[PDB]
Amino acid sequence: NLNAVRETMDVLLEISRILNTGLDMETLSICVRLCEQGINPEALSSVIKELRKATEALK
Template sequence: MTSEKNAQVGQARETFQMLFQISQLLNTGLDAETLTICIRLCELGVDPEVLAHVIKEIRKVGENAVQNKPSNLQPH
C-alpha cells in the first residue's frame, strides 16, 4: 500500500471514530456496524432524513412486537 493510500485509510478510520463518538453522544443507539451501513447508504445517495425516519419506524415495530408478545408461550 502506498503512503498516500495509508493516509487515506487512516483519515477514514479517524473520521469514522469521530462519527461514532458523535452518534454515542447523541444516544442514537447505533452500533458501529449499523452506523457503517448508514454511512454507506448516505454515500450512495440515500437521504439521511429518510434513513433516520426508516430507522425510527423499524424500532417502533420492534418495540411493539416485544410488547405484544404473549408471555405464556411454551416451546414445543
C-alpha cells in the first residue's frame, strides 16, 4: 500500500505547486496526514497564514 500512498501523495504536490501555495514537500506531508485525521480544512488555512505571519516579525 505504501507504494500507492506515495504516488497519491506525489501527484498532490503538483496541484499545490501550480496553485502557487507556499507548501513545500515536508509541510505537505504534515498537513496531508493531519487532514487525514479529520480536522476541518477551513481552519488550517488560518494557522499556516498566521505561523507564516509571526515568522516574518522575527526577520
